[PDB]
Design a protein around this ligand. Structure first.
Ligand SMILES: *[C@@H]1O[C@H](CO)[C@@H](O[C@@H]2O[C@H](CO)[C@@H](O[C@@H]3O[C@H](CO)[C@@H](O)[C@H](O)[C@@H]3O)[C@H](O)[C@H]2NC(C)=O)[C@H](O)[C@H]1NC(C)=O
Lengths: 587, 603
């Protein structure tokens, strides 16, 4: 029977992979085909593959191939027979796109840190990779599965202080490892705990192995066989920060998972310096690493389904980098994801004064006061454009000759409906970044006032700058939020009337708002200002900058505002508004 | 055991070198990372680009003149251009490098290379036997890249700035991010050779409205000799645009493979803010082992050339915005100057020595970058002011008062102690109060890192500045909103003199400000470390000699790190400041100081 050539280390995506098979599709996900024929682990792998969105039929359509031959354990693999089968696969094509899954790439006479089968061009997802046997953009490093993750369910113990500092629970280590661990234990004592040969036996003391790891803040993972140990998954599950002392070992999913925030890698020469290395790490970093290790276990190390999905996702990002998921989404726990901001306007650029701001003015059944404010607004320098949105559909716009004489190109937008959320629509006529939203009732603003507001906005392009000031307080008797404006010792919102903000915020309001706030506001004809403040605070994660030493900007309201605030807090799951006690006024 | 490690070291000492085999960690063995530059022989030509590289290394903080102390070596010989047809090629280099006393088979040598290979079948022809040396080559193929040994560096011209910055072209962050064109390219095409297959097939995808790609075969003698049946039309269409107007008016810029995988168009694309769409197969992008290029560019296989425009159109709008901003951040962080490139290479090498003291995948790919974030201070992101939004952490609620003393000082200590946010007070002589003995009247020693400072925020305050407790609380509350800046009362500005072409300093009734003085200022403790372990000894020594200008350098450093102005809050000696500012601008290469007309006040 034919046998392929040995694994080629000079085999990358741009040479071995065939991108013609999976060119482009709307849902940018690769297609995986499975050969019809096995260990229960490999069965769970194939079931996970078949029950995902990467599984397809009509072999001519699929881009990746996963043969149904058990390769996970190489101790009883019968290399030659597996090679004959892979050659016989009838669609091998020199293994151009075939994906192989393995977790123990070790041979009893010698450990090659890679699959010993020919696998000329086959792509490997192996549990143990050295930096010499791992192809960078071609291969995937995967965890080695431990049955304990399904056999025992450890309690979700939170981060905190623990009895032991450095723990080493492994079986059959090389004598030098044992000698140096014993030296560390005898040097320090009562903190370093080494366990001898699912039960751990210390001198005249017994522990349960999966649960003893819960009592240590650092756990040692050594290189004894295959360069990849199943103890790593147990260490991550128990929450203790792993300490990997393998010399040349590439951790699982290192392409996308940032292990610098979840583990400590110490070269095995400096083993006597391990304790001094770990003592330098402060408590907060230890807690963060415990959290990250637990998240890594619960997301990728938990079951074979997680491993298969992560491997296919990594390959998919390799095939379609433009649609790849973010490394932040990859390593952040759900709690961090909820807490994280990820500001989209993160680039710190200060726009030049040569540009301007397109003032958008909203009126309905008010013409004699719209004119009085458009006249004053038009005086402001660096006002590139002025848009007036006409809400009242029954009434007609005034005559063009009746409009004032201004220095800027005016335009009038004919609304299809009468909704107060139409002022936040991203207009293609807006050629600037800053957008000045001003209301007809707002009159006590000078040209210097607006110019200073715009100048302040230029220093904070990514947040909300507004003249009026409102905030929210918490009452114990109603156990809810209230809308407070009578007094001001702090601020958390500025009304959209007389406010400067980026047009990206208009885009967010129109499209990326959750599906409840926009329709609720279009129903209630109120609380657009509060919704915009909530959205800005949630997306940018920053406070709001008031710009006036002034409060009076005009010549069942409050209950409705409180209801709006409570509803907006409920739909976001929290209260994104941040209270600040500072205002910006000119020097 | 150790036998296995020795066997691995011996066996893999070749093309497959890594750090655990082809390196010696014993020479660094400390936080002090030092690089030694071989002295000039004064007998060979020196290219301007390699001269800039060596000046960046020499003027850096990793430079040492003692070969025993260093654990990284850089040759002074010209290695950037290894093409035999180039006018910068150095002959007899193979025998010349073996005559060096400190070569030691190039065990700990870093070699910079930008061009390799000759006219037929361009390859990695460095000429001399590199041995164990890791090369910071520009155009590296994927199958010829050592995953964690070599460094892929950008390819830059001889006119690339050495210390200064070009600031980028994205002045307006306009929405929609789309521009007049969708995908552009304007470069030569080669009739015969290697690397012209992708350039010859651009006329299929050329559209003329959104995807406009222009090529010419006029590249020498073949301008009329072997021209095919398309050179005439291609050249007539080519002479219609400018390659600069069409670069700043395009959302995406195509960067295909030429003769070599790397190209001059990459840095131009990053400067122009247009998202680069790379087509060269098997290219290790600059700092690919350190920078996530999926967040700053588009990577597409040139085998799937025809359907690229559909894929580029399918890219969502917010993704385009994120890519466009990431491009500018990368340009201003790691590619704006030769100094930034060289220091990026050295810092990437340094991160491989101590794996427990290094930068995570988030520091590099986020503001302000790895050059201003030194992991020796702390590998924990919460100890830096820049990473609170990315995490779920609020800024510290406690600060440390530091008073540099050379009476109001007694009243000042009492007033500051009454603050609810004050944990400890440190008094410098040249709530628990701490007094630290001083050995010299070095007034820049007030910025040193101290083990007694527990809080992240540090209030630096001179003895002659009387500050009320309520003012301290208000300033700290303001700083909690902007943890990355300097928040203080006394502010001074800067100006440009046309009469003398020298920067100027004002301190009276200015219309704006660009510096806030450290006499009544609040800032993160990390800037104490960055002031000491990042700024060169020359500037700080000049500060000590003149007995002023330490706070001006403080503001310079903070503005350079944050690219944002300080925030003022309220409610013969003079001639030295101008020279100080001019020297600081000369070292930095530009003026990080930014004017600001805002002033925060309590409500
Ligand atoms: C910005 O707004 C988003 C919502 O659009 C916030 O994300 C939401 O955060 C809350 C917690 O603050 C999450 O609630 C959680 O739900 C899980 C069940 O899925 C529950 O077990 C937890 O106890 C908690 O109640 C909510 O799921 C989450 N929603 C989404 C879509 O992510 C985000 O936190 C806001 N960010 C800021 C800075 O305000």
């Amino acid at each position: 029977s034919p046998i392929p050539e040995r694994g080629d280390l000079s085999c990358r995506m741009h040479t071995c992979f065939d991108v013609y098979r999976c060119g482009f599709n709307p849902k940018n996900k690769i297609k995986v085909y499975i050969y019809a024929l096995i260990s229960r682990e490999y069965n769970e792998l194939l079931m996970a593959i078949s029950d995902s969105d990467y599984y397809t039929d009509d072999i001519n359509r699929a881009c990746l191939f996963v043969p149904s031959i058990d390769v996970l354990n190489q101790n009883t693999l019968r290399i030659k027979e597996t090679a004959q089968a892979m050659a016989q696969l009838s669609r091998w094509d020199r293994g151009t796109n075939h994906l192989l899954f393995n977790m123990l790439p070790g041979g009893p006479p010698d450990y090659n840190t890679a699959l010993d089968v020919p696998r000329d061009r086959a792509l490997l997802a192996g549990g143990g990779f050295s930096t010499w046997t791992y192809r960078q953009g071609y291969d995937v490093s995967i965890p080695v599965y431990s049955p304990l993750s399904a056999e025992v369910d450890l309690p979700e113990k939170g981060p905190g202080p623990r009895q032991y500092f450095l723990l080493s629970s492994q079986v059959g280590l090389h004598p030098e490892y044992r000698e140096d661990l014993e030296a560390l234990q005898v040097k320090h004592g009562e903190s370093v705990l080494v366990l001898d040969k699912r039960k751990r036996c210390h001198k005249h003391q017994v522990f349960d192995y999966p649960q003893v790891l819960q009592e240590a803040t650092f756990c040692v993972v050594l290189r004894g066989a295959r360069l990849g140990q199943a103890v790593l998954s147990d260490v991550l599950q128990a929450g203790c920060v792993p300490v990997v002392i393998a010399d040349s070992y590439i951790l699982p999913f290192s392409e996308v998972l940032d292990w610098k925030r979840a583990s400590v890698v110490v070269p095995e020469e400096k083993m006597s310096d391990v304790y001094s290395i770990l003592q330098s790490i402060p408590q907060r970093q230890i807690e963060e690493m415990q959290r990250q290790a637990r998240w890594f276990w619960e997301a990728y190390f938990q079951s074979i389904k997680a491993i298969a999905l992560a491997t296919l996702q990594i390959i998919n990002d390799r095939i379609y980098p433009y649609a790849a998921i973010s490394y932040e989404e990859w390593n952040d726990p759900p709690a961090v994801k909820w807490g994280s901001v990820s500001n989209p306007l993160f680039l710190p650029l200060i726009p030049p004064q040569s540009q301007g701001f397109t003032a958008i003015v909203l009126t309905y059944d008010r013409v004699e006061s719209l004119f009085r404010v458009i006249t004053e607004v038009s005086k402001v320098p660096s006002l590139s454009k002025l848009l007036v949105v006409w809400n009242n559909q029954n009434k007609n716009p005034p005559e063009d000759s009746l409009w004032p004489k201004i220095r800027v190109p005016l335009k009038v937008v004919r609304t299809a409906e009468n909704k107060l959320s139409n002022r936040f629509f991203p207009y293609d006529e807006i050629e600037t970044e800053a957008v000045l939203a001003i209301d007809d009732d707002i009159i006590m603003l000078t040209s210097d006032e607006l110019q200073f507001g715009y100048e302040v906005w230029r220093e904070f392009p990514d947040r909300l700058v507004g003249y009026p000031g409102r905030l929210h307080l918490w009452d114990h008797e109603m156990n809810k939020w209230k809308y407070e404006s009578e007094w001001t010792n702090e601020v958390s919102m500025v009304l959209t009337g007389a406010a400067f903000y980026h047009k990206y915020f208009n885009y967010l309001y129109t499209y990326k708002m959750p599906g409840d706030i926009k329709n609720w506001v279009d129903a209630h004809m109120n609380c657009e200002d509060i919704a915009m403040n909530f959205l800005v605070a949630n997306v940018t994660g920053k406070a709001v900058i008031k710009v006036t030493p002034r409060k009076k900007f005009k010549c069942t309201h409050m209950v409705e505002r409180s209801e709006c605030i409570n509803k907006f807090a409920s739909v976001f799951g929290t209260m994104p508004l941040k209270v600040v006690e500072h205002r910006a006024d000119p020097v | 055991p150790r036998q296995k490690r020795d066997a691995n070291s011996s066996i893999y000492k070749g093309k497959k070198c890594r750090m655990e085999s082809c390196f010696d960690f014993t020479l660094c063995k400390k936080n002090g990372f030092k690089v030694y530059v071989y002295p000039q022989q004064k007998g060979e030509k020196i290219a301007e680009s390699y001269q800039n590289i060596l000046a960046a290394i020499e003027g850096s903080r990793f430079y040492t003149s003692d070969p025993s102390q260093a654990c990284l070596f850089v040759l002074s010989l010209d290695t950037l251009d290894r093409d035999q047809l180039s006018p910068q090629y150095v002959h007899n280099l193979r025998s010349k490098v073996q005559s060096l006393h400190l070569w030691n088979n190039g065990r700990n040598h870093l070699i910079f290379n930008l061009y390799s290979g000759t006219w037929p079948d361009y390859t990695e022809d460095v000429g001399f036997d590199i041995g164990q040396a890791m090369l910071a080559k520009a155009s590296i193929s994927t199958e010829n890249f050592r995953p964690n040994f070599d460094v892929s560096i950008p390819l830059f011209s001889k006119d690339h700035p050495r210390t200064g910055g070009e600031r980028g072209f994205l002045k307006f962050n306009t929405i929609p991010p789309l521009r007049k064109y969708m995908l552009v390219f304007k470069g030569k095409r080669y009739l015969t050779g290697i690397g012209s297959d992708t350039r010859n097939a651009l006329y299929h995808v050329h559209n003329g409205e959104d995807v406009v790609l222009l090529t010419t075969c006029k590249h020498g003698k073949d301008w009329q000799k072997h021209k095919d049946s398309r050179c005439d039309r291609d050249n007539t269409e080519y002479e219609k645009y400018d390659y600069r107007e069409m670069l700043h008016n395009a959302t995406f810029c195509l960067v295909p493979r030429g003769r070599r995988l790397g190209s001059f168009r990459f840095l131009e694309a990053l400067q122009a803010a247009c998202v680069p769409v790379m087509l060269s197969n098997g290219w290790e992008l600059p700092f690919s082992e350190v920078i996530n290029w999926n967040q700053a560019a588009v990577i597409g296989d040139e085998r799937l050339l025809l359907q690229i425009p559909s894929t580029i159109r399918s890219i969502h709008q917010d993704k385009i915005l994120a890519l466009r901003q990431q491009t500018q951040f990368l340009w201003e962080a790691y590619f704006s100057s030769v100094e930034k490139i060289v220091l990026t290479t050295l810092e990437i090498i340094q991160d491989r020595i101590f794996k427990h003291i290094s930068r995570n995948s988030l520091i590099w790919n986020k503001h302000p970058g790895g050059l201003f974030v030194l992991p020796q201070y702390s590998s924990y992101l919460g100890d830096f002011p820049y990473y609170y939004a990315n995490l779920g952490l609020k800024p510290p609620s406690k600060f440390t008062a530091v008073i540099h003393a050379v009476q109001p000082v007694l009243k000042l200590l009492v007033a500051a102690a009454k603050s609810q946010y004050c944990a400890q007070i440190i008094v410098l002589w040249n709530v628990p109060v701490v007094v630290i003995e001083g050995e010299s009247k070095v007034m820049s020693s007030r910025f040193l890192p101290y083990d007694n400072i527990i809080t992240d925020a540090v209030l630096s305050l001179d003895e002659d500045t009387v500050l009320s407790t309520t003012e301290v609380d208000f300033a700290f509350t303001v700083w909690q909103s902007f943890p990355e800046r300097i928040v203080g009362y006394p502010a001074r500005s800067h100006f440009w003199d046309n009469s003398k072409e020298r920067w100027g300093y004002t301190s009276k009734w200015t219309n704006d400000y660009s510096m806030v003085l450290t006499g009544a200022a609040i800032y993160h403790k990390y800037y104490h470390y960055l002031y000491s372990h990042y700024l060169p000894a020359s500037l700080k020594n000049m500060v000590d000699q003149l007995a002023n200008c330490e706070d001006i350098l403080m503001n310079f450093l903070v503005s350079a790190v944050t690219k944002l102005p300080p925030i003022k809050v309220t409610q013969d000696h003079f001639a030295q400041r101008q020279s100080c500012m001019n020297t600081f601008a000369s070292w930095f290469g530009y003026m990080p100081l930014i004017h600001s007309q805002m002033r925060l006040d309590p409500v």
